Amino acid sequence: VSKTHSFMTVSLIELWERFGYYGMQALIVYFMVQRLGFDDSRANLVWSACAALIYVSPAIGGWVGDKILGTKRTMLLGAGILSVGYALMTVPTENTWFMFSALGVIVVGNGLFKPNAGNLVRKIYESKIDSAFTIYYMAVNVGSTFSMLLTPWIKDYVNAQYGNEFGWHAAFAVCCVGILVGLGNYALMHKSLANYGSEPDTRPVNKKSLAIVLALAALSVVASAIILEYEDVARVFVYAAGVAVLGIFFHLIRTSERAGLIAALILTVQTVFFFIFYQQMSTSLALFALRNVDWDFQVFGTHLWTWSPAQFQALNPIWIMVLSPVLAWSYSIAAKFALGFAVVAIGFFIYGFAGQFAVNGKTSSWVMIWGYASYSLGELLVSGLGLAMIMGGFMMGAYFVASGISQYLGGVVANFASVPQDLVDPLQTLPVYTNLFNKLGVAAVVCTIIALAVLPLMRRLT
Amino acid sequence: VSKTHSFMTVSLIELWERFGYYGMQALIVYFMVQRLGFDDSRANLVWSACAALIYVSPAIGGWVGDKILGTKRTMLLGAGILSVGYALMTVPTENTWFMFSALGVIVVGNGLFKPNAGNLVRKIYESKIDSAFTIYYMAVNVGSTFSMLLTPWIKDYVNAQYGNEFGWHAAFAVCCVGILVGLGNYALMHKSLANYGSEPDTRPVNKKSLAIVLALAALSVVASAIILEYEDVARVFVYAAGVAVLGIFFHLIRTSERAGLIAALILTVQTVFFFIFYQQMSTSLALFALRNVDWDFQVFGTHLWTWSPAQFQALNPIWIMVLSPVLAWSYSIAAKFALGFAVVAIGFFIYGFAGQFAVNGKTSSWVMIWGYASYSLGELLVSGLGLAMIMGGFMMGAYFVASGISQYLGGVVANFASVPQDLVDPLQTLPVYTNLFNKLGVAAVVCTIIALAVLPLMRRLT
Amino acid sequence: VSKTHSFMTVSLIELWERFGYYGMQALIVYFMVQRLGFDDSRANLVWSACAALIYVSPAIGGWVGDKILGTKRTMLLGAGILSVGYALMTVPTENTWFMFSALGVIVVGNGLFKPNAGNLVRKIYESKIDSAFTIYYMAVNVGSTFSMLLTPWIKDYVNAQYGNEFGWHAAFAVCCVGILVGLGNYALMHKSLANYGSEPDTRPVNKKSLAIVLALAALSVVASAIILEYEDVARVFVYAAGVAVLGIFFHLIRTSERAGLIAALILTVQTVFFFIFYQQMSTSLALFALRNVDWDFQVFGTHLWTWSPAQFQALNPIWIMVLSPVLAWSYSIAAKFALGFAVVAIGFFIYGFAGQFAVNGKTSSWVMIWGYASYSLGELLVSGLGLAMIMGGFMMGAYFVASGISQYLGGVVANFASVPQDLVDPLQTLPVYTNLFNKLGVAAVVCTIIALAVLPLMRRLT
Amino acid sequence: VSKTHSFMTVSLIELWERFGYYGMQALIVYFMVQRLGFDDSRANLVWSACAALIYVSPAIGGWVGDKILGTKRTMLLGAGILSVGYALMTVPTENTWFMFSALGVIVVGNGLFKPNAGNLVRKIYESKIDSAFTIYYMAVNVGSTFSMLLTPWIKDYVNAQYGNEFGWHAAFAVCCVGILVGLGNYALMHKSLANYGSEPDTRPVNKKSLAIVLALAALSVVASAIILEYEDVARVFVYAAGVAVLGIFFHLIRTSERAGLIAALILTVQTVFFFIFYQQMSTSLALFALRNVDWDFQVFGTHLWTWSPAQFQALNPIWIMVLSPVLAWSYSIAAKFALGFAVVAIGFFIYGFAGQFAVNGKTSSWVMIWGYASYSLGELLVSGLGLAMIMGGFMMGAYFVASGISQYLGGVVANFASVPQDLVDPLQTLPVYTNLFNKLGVAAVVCTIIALAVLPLMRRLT
């Protein structure tokens, strides 16, 4: 019909699928602690190891749909794998297979979707696509905001009303229909994109091609599955990649004429220094949100509402929507890069800094609201790196696999919070929580220096 | 005679008529509490419901004088209705008809004046009329400053000197001669504008036209009158408008080709989010100025003067005159819009924040002087909206009637201060005043996000 | 010889004559309190009334030397009247004629000099004379700095060594040779300016002209003298000027076509609002520096040096030399004017604000160092007014005589510090000093509004 | 081979030789206090007097290598004199000849190197050599950072493990192989610079020239040696220079047509005002780091690592690498010069300011980390002076010799910390340390005024 009339049907199906994902990534780390009876140091590792599967997952979906099936059926097929992916999550037992089962089932379902969203959006224009994409990114951001503000309040509503543990699984179902919502938001308008097809679905489909794809999906389903039964295999797949991915450049650091490669490695070794700090909010900060912070969010002197145990992790698409034409105040190179590490640094100092004050037995209620603004403030302006530094065929995935490796090592950082499950009084939990955030932040200042230390070398080579 | 010699005779008659209005809007809310014996929750509603009549009132006067009588006689006729409008106010009884009588009598007297002031000023130029209007607006602002700084000090001077309640009515008479002043400021110079007539008073007047106008005025006088005898009718006129005014766009949100209409609704639904916060200074803050704040305005350690109970509401044309070429510091789109909500937000936090400290029995004397600067700081730069976004015949008044509806809902916000009239000790009043301003301000931060959440959508459509 | 070689001989003779003047204006107010046995309220008035003679005094010298004798002999004759002007000051008795005698003897000696300095400097160029004058002004400022930092330390050195009161007169002699220094700094180089003569001393001198000039000087000497014997005559000369100088514009406010005159009066009535606040540092602050401030200038915790009782008034050519290419940070109308009043305002609040804290019996040692920076910060950028707004013959002196009238009214402001001379314990002096500086500063904020209140009227008329 | 391929072999040999030097200038002042049994006031003077030899030392090496031997062999010969220069330092006795011996042996070894580094770098370009040099300067700065962070931790590792004093000499050997490292970093690549020779080593070498050079070196070795045996000779060589170097301009202040010379002296007398404040970090602050500061670097509440007694002096190439494209924020004359003195001033106030608080017996652990940032903040932007103000043959070294004289007078400033070696309890050391840093800083503000006091004179003469 029209350009902008075409634009919603990929915006809105993203707006609902993205709404599905964050309901998982909200409580599932905080889930497997007090209900099941996991220790916690086992439990930190799981989503830790899970996340590395997920950032590398746009590569596979970057391979499949643009080359085999066509984008649109891959945009179709990437949908309702999450339909199993939470209906399997919500069957109310406690047998610990289903839990670790469907987590990897998400991955190809995530994978066949995320570089299949914007890739067609990149071809309804043919370049001020930011004027198209900043609809979409702030369509993600309006969409992702609706998510975790809601998706544990359902979990709050149940488990002192219906009687037993029939509620943790219930809130999982909220995103389950939410992806089924995103079906019908497409299904009732799936004629709009008909003039903007990819390149295989110009021609009709191939079941000779399709059966292998779902088989290699079903290969990858079980491949992503067999991890969390005895976590040592997660190490062994990294130490074959994590040696050979530094070896990816060993073919062309000093052997290969144009040393922008190692300067792209200079960005790359800097890039891994990001994501190691991120995963703490999905890990230890969630444990920090369990047995220290009071849930009596009192402004000044009055009384307000008790928080969730974990809608803290919903604050993150507030600030990347607030501080996001603010950080588009242009007039009023990758080192804007750097000083954001110091934001992450001064982020971390705060968390002992209130526990410095208000020992009450417990911590101090507030704290977090300026915490999450810090990490977001560097998070906005630093993507596009080797995707900014635009002979390719290895240069493509070289940034990707290490990025997932960078995603992995947050768990092996965060392990020091392992209070034994016998220590009950949180007068003695805080002194082991204070000994981790500061010395994480001490070296977090030291990170700032290292980009600056080689900083004037870049201005010449460009 | 001359252009600038013509310019005073509309400036000065505005400068005196505007001087009349604020004497009413100063104490009349604080009037009907401790003298009559109203509760207070009845009393908040009255000026609350009165104000909605007044912002819609330039529309009717925008219809009458430019089309029927001519501007000048409408500029004449809009004057001395206030002459009854305060001489009726000042007759010293306590029978509660006169009070609610003349309040609506103001309205057409206000109505036939405010878009008849500047409309001729718009035609002594034929466009840097801001270089004409910023005389006028700061002629309003020099004029409006003289007002409420004075108009309750008269009320102070009486009621412990002359003996009884013969003083509340006395200060009302100060503006009564003040409008009679504005007669003679015109009447001794009413030959100057003779070359700048409208379009009916090019021709001679029509009593065949005039008698209906004053009849429809006298219709509207009683129509505006019959409200405050049993306040439920004020609801019922809103719920016929407030449904049909959202229905005004229902003819042309999704039916009507050019979606700037709903983006003008995006400004509009944002616009209503303003005025709901305004009316608190004309309502609850005045009650907050009665039985908490000490009147011992002590700078640092010395002694100064006891305040009025309500010249606080005079501070508002100070700051919109101070901060008003400051906010014309240009080089050193409607989202400048937005962050002013955060000013209104951080405005409100202060009021418990001093009561947080100086519990003395009572509150803490100071407080307010930085309070009123906040609301003004957003108030300067946000008008001109659909009057900035310039097929019209419904688009005109659609912003207006909802704006008065937006004016209305402040009273149904502010009702929570209803202390029963038996509770005397203000040690127990403050804990019910602290429970309202914070959670008004809590969501006042939440307002800031919502313009930002859809903010990048505007830059494309223009 | 050369341009710049000519430039010193008027720079340096200014640099020494200006060095002479400030030695007087340093302690002479603080002189006539504890030695003689004056009360203090008599003593405040004297330099108060003296100062008004002095700012009007460039007008008379603006008349004499450029028209009668020639600049150079008037530059000569304006010198060593101060030679009597301090040798008369230093004769060691206590008879109170000499004191009030030579104060007015300064005036014509000041008068025949200050507009005779730069007027020739204006004609060694024939216009980037600021590149000439900012040598000179910062030659004044390097010169004036050497002054009062030294000229009471001599007074410190004597009066507990030589035995009696033979020292107050001694420090007066320091500037006495200092003007005799400025003789020889000219006298050993008085051939340099020989090619840059005025216009009478092109021709030879006239004793027929000269004898009247010194007679009218000797008329003006006794005329300036007969003031301080019974101070009521000082009123009566103002109330003939101060009525007729407002009457100077009464010929041409509303009678005289071009209303920049009253806008120049708008600057003028604003201009008088300056100087009323200035004279406090030459008056009450000096009394505030007598019997409150401890002289134990302790940085942090150690020990430093005891101050003078009055080198505080030497701080003022420090800051107008520090903050003076700072305030020439241009890119990184007279309302820059205005906000400097708020600097003067926030200046004054400090003085009770430390006495708020450190009641020790006495005040708090520090205080002043940020005080004097405030008054200077507005003092730099506000001269040149009607001398900026460039049919003249009355427009010239109209700003001048009111400026001296503005100089006068500081004394009738500062009178409220009149502690009776019997009250010894400074525990009870501070509560009458706190009651004056705040309410001076309360209205000092109110001054800021008044320029802003008419501020947009100026941008049109220019 | 290539330009940038040539660029390392002078970068890296600088990067290792500079790495050698700072290992000495780190602990050698703190060395001769508690081990040997020196008082301290003798010990301050030694490196104090040593430093003056070192800044003048680029002049001699600016004479030798570019004119006699050729740069490259002078770049060769300037290396391994430090090889003796620390192997002599490390022979484990306590006879106090070796200590004062090899300190001057450094000097010609430093001298034949520092203007022989960049001088060839100035001729691999032939002018955006800053785009070459900011590699090098931040190659110095990446190199110099590796230094003192490490070179007393070796000294920590020994002297409570191996038993006795066999460790102070051990850490000296760390730089000894480090210069031997810088041999092989050249020696394994000494064919790269072969096309970029100086001008003597175009031709073959001369042993008829060489033997005098090493003899005049061996003259200068003993000449620099005979100082510290009885320190009065160090005075007598200054008072022959320090009179005649002010006499260097006495030939051409007022005798010599172009007064930029004295304005270059205006920079010069300002320039000496720098370096007097510097040497305190190499002197008294090191003593301040001995017997006041606790070594329990506790962030907030936890526990971290005990410091060194002197890696504080390693902080200085952190900040001049952090704050060094920050201070290259250009758009967002020598008076940028000036306000950095106020940074040095507000630097010094801090050191009593924490001892003001946390008297514990001892001082307060933290303190220093914001201290060293201050001195660096002026240190970046102020070099290049008479090397910026570009008839030479005396104008060259005139800035140099006074700069070393300026280097000298820090020791005669810092002498006031001479606690007698008997006073043990550091409750009584701090009150003599507080009495020095403040009144050093009191006049440090006074320095700021003096450039400003003559500041507008410069803008005309250029």
Side-chain angles (χ1 to χ4, degrees), chain D residues 154-165 167-174:
Chain D
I154 292 97
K155 180 255 286 183
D156 300 331
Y157 180 68
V158 179
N159 294 317
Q161 282 67 231
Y162 292 176
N164 57 4
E165 293 178 353
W168 291 93
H169 301 281
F172 275 143
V174 180

PDB file of all heavy atoms in Angstrom, chain D residues 154-174, unseen atoms left out:
ATOM      1  N   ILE D 154      59.250  -4.594  43.662  1.00  0.00           N
ATOM      2  CA  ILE D 154      60.419  -5.455  43.803  1.00  0.00           C
ATOM      3  C   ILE D 154      61.082  -5.222  45.150  1.00  0.00           C
ATOM      4  O   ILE D 154      61.402  -6.170  45.875  1.00  0.00           O
ATOM      5  CB  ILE D 154      61.398  -5.210  42.641  1.00  0.00           C
ATOM      6  CG1 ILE D 154      60.824  -5.697  41.312  1.00  0.00           C
ATOM      7  CG2 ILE D 154      62.693  -5.907  42.886  1.00  0.00           C
ATOM      8  CD1 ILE D 154      60.182  -4.647  40.465  1.00  0.00           C
ATOM      9  N   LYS D 155      61.227  -3.953  45.530  1.00  0.00           N
ATOM     10  CA  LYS D 155      61.805  -3.590  46.817  1.00  0.00           C
ATOM     11  C   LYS D 155      60.924  -4.034  47.972  1.00  0.00           C
ATOM     12  O   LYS D 155      61.423  -4.316  49.067  1.00  0.00           O
ATOM     13  CB  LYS D 155      62.043  -2.080  46.835  1.00  0.00           C
ATOM     14  CG  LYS D 155      62.646  -1.498  48.100  1.00  0.00           C
ATOM     15  CD  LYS D 155      61.631  -0.745  48.967  1.00  0.00           C
ATOM     16  CE  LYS D 155      61.262   0.609  48.354  1.00  0.00           C
ATOM     17  NZ  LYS D 155      60.336   1.411  49.202  1.00  0.00           N
ATOM     18  N   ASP D 156      59.622  -4.139  47.742  1.00  0.00           N
ATOM     19  CA  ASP D 156      58.741  -4.658  48.773  1.00  0.00           C
ATOM     20  C   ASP D 156      58.947  -6.150  48.956  1.00  0.00           C
ATOM     21  O   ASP D 156      58.911  -6.658  50.083  1.00  0.00           O
ATOM     22  CB  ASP D 156      57.296  -4.381  48.390  1.00  0.00           C
ATOM     23  CG  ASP D 156      57.016  -2.918  48.230  1.00  0.00           C
ATOM     24  OD1 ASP D 156      57.684  -2.106  48.894  1.00  0.00           O
ATOM     25  OD2 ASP D 156      56.146  -2.576  47.414  1.00  0.00           O
ATOM     26  N   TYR D 157      59.192  -6.857  47.853  1.00  0.00           N
ATOM     27  CA  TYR D 157      59.189  -8.314  47.827  1.00  0.00           C
ATOM     28  C   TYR D 157      60.362  -8.911  48.585  1.00  0.00           C
ATOM     29  O   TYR D 157      60.302 -10.080  48.976  1.00  0.00           O
ATOM     30  CB  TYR D 157      59.171  -8.782  46.357  1.00  0.00           C
ATOM     31  CG  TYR D 157      59.170 -10.283  46.100  1.00  0.00           C
ATOM     32  CD1 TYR D 157      58.077 -11.070  46.435  1.00  0.00           C
ATOM     33  CD2 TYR D 157      60.240 -10.896  45.459  1.00  0.00           C
ATOM     34  CE1 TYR D 157      58.075 -12.435  46.187  1.00  0.00           C
ATOM     35  CE2 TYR D 157      60.241 -12.257  45.205  1.00  0.00           C
ATOM     36  CZ  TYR D 157      59.156 -13.019  45.571  1.00  0.00           C
ATOM     37  OH  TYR D 157      59.151 -14.370  45.323  1.00  0.00           O
ATOM     38  N   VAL D 158      61.389  -8.127  48.879  1.00  0.00           N
ATOM     39  CA  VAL D 158      62.635  -8.706  49.346  1.00  0.00           C
ATOM     40  C   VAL D 158      62.757  -8.653  50.859  1.00  0.00           C
ATOM     41  O   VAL D 158      62.845  -9.690  51.519  1.00  0.00           O
ATOM     42  CB  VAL D 158      63.828  -8.001  48.693  1.00  0.00           C
ATOM     43  CG1 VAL D 158      65.095  -8.598  49.203  1.00  0.00           C
ATOM     44  CG2 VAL D 158      63.754  -8.137  47.198  1.00  0.00           C
ATOM     45  N   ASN D 159      62.728  -7.449  51.425  1.00  0.00           N
ATOM     46  CA  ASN D 159      63.385  -7.168  52.702  1.00  0.00           C
ATOM     47  C   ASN D 159      62.692  -7.706  53.951  1.00  0.00           C
ATOM     48  O   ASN D 159      63.023  -7.299  55.067  1.00  0.00           O
ATOM     49  CB  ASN D 159      63.566  -5.661  52.841  1.00  0.00           C
ATOM     50  CG  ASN D 159      64.521  -5.097  51.811  1.00  0.00           C
ATOM     51  OD1 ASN D 159      65.570  -5.676  51.535  1.00  0.00           O
ATOM     52  ND2 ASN D 159      64.153  -3.967  51.227  1.00  0.00           N
ATOM     53  N   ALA D 160      61.726  -8.601  53.785  1.00  0.00           N
ATOM     54  CA  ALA D 160      61.230  -9.423  54.879  1.00  0.00           C
ATOM     55  C   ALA D 160      61.141 -10.877  54.442  1.00  0.00           C
ATOM     56  O   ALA D 160      60.425 -11.670  55.057  1.00  0.00           O
ATOM     57  CB  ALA D 160      59.876  -8.922  55.380  1.00  0.00           C
ATOM     58  N   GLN D 161      61.854 -11.222  53.374  1.00  0.00           N
ATOM     59  CA  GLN D 161      61.961 -12.576  52.852  1.00  0.00           C
ATOM     60  C   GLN D 161      63.398 -13.061  52.838  1.00  0.00           C
ATOM     61  O   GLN D 161      63.698 -14.106  53.422  1.00  0.00           O
ATOM     62  CB  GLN D 161      61.393 -12.650  51.427  1.00  0.00           C
ATOM     63  CG  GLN D 161      59.881 -12.703  51.288  1.00  0.00           C
ATOM     64  CD  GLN D 161      59.199 -11.438  51.729  1.00  0.00           C
ATOM     65  OE1 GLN D 161      58.263 -11.468  52.521  1.00  0.00           O
ATOM     66  NE2 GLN D 161      59.712 -10.308  51.277  1.00  0.00           N
ATOM     67  N   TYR D 162      64.298 -12.324  52.182  1.00  0.00           N
ATOM     68  CA  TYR D 162      65.703 -12.706  52.095  1.00  0.00           C
ATOM     69  C   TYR D 162      66.484 -12.357  53.351  1.00  0.00           C
ATOM     70  O   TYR D 162      67.640 -12.771  53.473  1.00  0.00           O
ATOM     71  CB  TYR D 162      66.405 -12.053  50.894  1.00  0.00           C
ATOM     72  CG  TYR D 162      65.976 -12.518  49.519  1.00  0.00           C
ATOM     73  CD1 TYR D 162      66.504 -11.929  48.384  1.00  0.00           C
ATOM     74  CD2 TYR D 162      65.089 -13.566  49.355  1.00  0.00           C
ATOM     75  CE1 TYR D 162      66.131 -12.344  47.134  1.00  0.00           C
ATOM     76  CE2 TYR D 162      64.705 -13.982  48.111  1.00  0.00           C
ATOM     77  CZ  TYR D 162      65.230 -13.372  47.005  1.00  0.00           C
ATOM     78  OH  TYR D 162      64.843 -13.800  45.757  1.00  0.00           O
ATOM     79  N   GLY D 163      65.903 -11.588  54.268  1.00  0.00           N
ATOM     80  CA  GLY D 163      66.520 -11.398  55.565  1.00  0.00           C
ATOM     81  C   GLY D 163      67.025 -10.005  55.876  1.00  0.00           C
ATOM     82  O   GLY D 163      66.640  -9.429  56.897  1.00  0.00           O
ATOM     83  N   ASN D 164      67.896  -9.455  55.030  1.00  0.00           N
ATOM     84  CA  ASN D 164      68.525  -8.183  55.360  1.00  0.00           C
ATOM     85  C   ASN D 164      68.283  -7.106  54.308  1.00  0.00           C
ATOM     86  O   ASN D 164      67.294  -7.151  53.574  1.00  0.00           O
ATOM     87  CB  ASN D 164      70.029  -8.381  55.605  1.00  0.00           C
ATOM     88  CG  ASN D 164      70.762  -9.003  54.420  1.00  0.00           C
ATOM     89  OD1 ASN D 164      70.190  -9.248  53.359  1.00  0.00           O
ATOM     90  ND2 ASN D 164      72.052  -9.258  54.608  1.00  0.00           N
ATOM     91  N   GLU D 165      69.205  -6.148  54.212  1.00  0.00           N
ATOM     92  CA  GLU D 165      69.075  -4.991  53.335  1.00  0.00           C
ATOM     93  C   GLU D 165      69.478  -5.282  51.901  1.00  0.00           C
ATOM     94  O   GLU D 165      69.830  -4.357  51.163  1.00  0.00           O
ATOM     95  CB  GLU D 165      69.913  -3.832  53.873  1.00  0.00           C
ATOM     96  CG  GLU D 165      69.436  -3.250  55.187  1.00  0.00           C
ATOM     97  CD  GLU D 165      70.345  -2.141  55.681  1.00  0.00           C
ATOM     98  OE1 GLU D 165      71.412  -1.930  55.069  1.00  0.00           O
ATOM     99  OE2 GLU D 165      69.996  -1.475  56.675  1.00  0.00           O
ATOM    100  N   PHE D 166      69.428  -6.533  51.470  1.00  0.00           N
ATOM    101  CA  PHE D 166      69.850  -6.880  50.126  1.00  0.00           C
ATOM    102  C   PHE D 166      68.769  -6.648  49.088  1.00  0.00           C
ATOM    103  O   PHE D 166      68.700  -7.412  48.122  1.00  0.00           O
ATOM    104  CB  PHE D 166      70.306  -8.339  50.079  1.00  0.00           C
ATOM    105  N   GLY D 167      67.937  -5.622  49.241  1.00  0.00           N
ATOM    106  CA  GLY D 167      66.803  -5.463  48.360  1.00  0.00           C
ATOM    107  C   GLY D 167      66.679  -4.095  47.739  1.00  0.00           C
ATOM    108  O   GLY D 167      66.162  -3.978  46.624  1.00  0.00           O
ATOM    109  N   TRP D 168      67.109  -3.058  48.464  1.00  0.00           N
ATOM    110  CA  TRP D 168      67.114  -1.705  47.914  1.00  0.00           C
ATOM    111  C   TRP D 168      67.969  -1.637  46.664  1.00  0.00           C
ATOM    112  O   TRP D 168      67.597  -1.010  45.664  1.00  0.00           O
ATOM    113  CB  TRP D 168      67.647  -0.727  48.954  1.00  0.00           C
ATOM    114  CG  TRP D 168      66.754  -0.519  50.110  1.00  0.00           C
ATOM    115  CD1 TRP D 168      66.777  -1.178  51.296  1.00  0.00           C
ATOM    116  CD2 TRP D 168      65.717   0.438  50.202  1.00  0.00           C
ATOM    117  NE1 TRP D 168      65.798  -0.700  52.122  1.00  0.00           N
ATOM    118  CE2 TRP D 168      65.132   0.296  51.469  1.00  0.00           C
ATOM    119  CE3 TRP D 168      65.214   1.393  49.330  1.00  0.00           C
ATOM    120  CZ2 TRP D 168      64.075   1.074  51.882  1.00  0.00           C
ATOM    121  CZ3 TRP D 168      64.174   2.163  49.737  1.00  0.00           C
ATOM    122  CH2 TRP D 168      63.607   2.004  51.002  1.00  0.00           C
ATOM    123  N   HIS D 169      69.104  -2.319  46.700  1.00  0.00           N
ATOM    124  CA  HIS D 169      69.958  -2.457  45.542  1.00  0.00           C
ATOM    125  C   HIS D 169      69.345  -3.370  44.495  1.00  0.00           C
ATOM    126  O   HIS D 169      69.652  -3.221  43.311  1.00  0.00           O
ATOM    127  CB  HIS D 169      71.306  -2.973  46.022  1.00  0.00           C
ATOM    128  CG  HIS D 169      71.953  -2.067  47.014  1.00  0.00           C
ATOM    129  ND1 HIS D 169      72.619  -0.920  46.645  1.00  0.00           N
ATOM    130  CD2 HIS D 169      71.977  -2.101  48.366  1.00  0.00           C
ATOM    131  CE1 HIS D 169      73.057  -0.304  47.729  1.00  0.00           C
ATOM    132  NE2 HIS D 169      72.679  -0.999  48.787  1.00  0.00           N
ATOM    133  N   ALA D 170      68.472  -4.289  44.901  1.00  0.00           N
ATOM    134  CA  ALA D 170      67.916  -5.239  43.950  1.00  0.00           C
ATOM    135  C   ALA D 170      66.963  -4.555  42.986  1.00  0.00           C
ATOM    136  O   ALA D 170      67.007  -4.803  41.778  1.00  0.00           O
ATOM    137  CB  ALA D 170      67.213  -6.372  44.689  1.00  0.00           C
ATOM    138  N   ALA D 171      66.116  -3.667  43.499  1.00  0.00           N
ATOM    139  CA  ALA D 171      65.138  -3.002  42.649  1.00  0.00           C
ATOM    140  C   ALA D 171      65.794  -2.030  41.698  1.00  0.00           C
ATOM    141  O   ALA D 171      65.243  -1.746  40.632  1.00  0.00           O
ATOM    142  CB  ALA D 171      64.108  -2.273  43.506  1.00  0.00           C
ATOM    143  N   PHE D 172      66.957  -1.518  42.078  1.00  0.00           N
ATOM    144  CA  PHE D 172      67.783  -0.744  41.172  1.00  0.00           C
ATOM    145  C   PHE D 172      68.183  -1.540  39.940  1.00  0.00           C
ATOM    146  O   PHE D 172      68.290  -0.973  38.848  1.00  0.00           O
ATOM    147  CB  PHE D 172      69.006  -0.264  41.933  1.00  0.00           C
ATOM    148  CG  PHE D 172      68.786   0.995  42.701  1.00  0.00           C
ATOM    149  CD1 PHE D 172      69.375   1.173  43.935  1.00  0.00           C
ATOM    150  CD2 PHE D 172      67.952   1.978  42.213  1.00  0.00           C
ATOM    151  CE1 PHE D 172      69.176   2.329  44.642  1.00  0.00           C
ATOM    152  CE2 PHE D 172      67.759   3.138  42.909  1.00  0.00           C
ATOM    153  CZ  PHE D 172      68.367   3.311  44.127  1.00  0.00           C
ATOM    154  N   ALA D 173      68.373  -2.851  40.082  1.00  0.00           N
ATOM    155  CA  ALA D 173      68.779  -3.662  38.944  1.00  0.00           C
ATOM    156  C   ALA D 173      67.665  -3.866  37.937  1.00  0.00           C
ATOM    157  O   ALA D 173      67.946  -4.324  36.825  1.00  0.00           O
ATOM    158  CB  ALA D 173      69.279  -5.024  39.415  1.00  0.00           C
ATOM    159  N   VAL D 174      66.423  -3.556  38.308  1.00  0.00           N
ATOM    160  CA  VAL D 174      65.297  -3.768  37.408  1.00  0.00           C
ATOM    161  C   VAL D 174      65.418  -2.862  36.191  1.00  0.00           C
ATOM    162  O   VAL D 174      65.252  -3.303  35.048  1.00  0.00           O
ATOM    163  CB  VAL D 174      63.973  -3.552  38.168  1.00  0.00           C
ATOM    164  CG1 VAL D 174      62.785  -3.755  37.254  1.00  0.00           C
ATOM    165  CG2 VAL D 174      63.882  -4.489  39.362  1.00  0.00           C
TER     166      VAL D 174
END
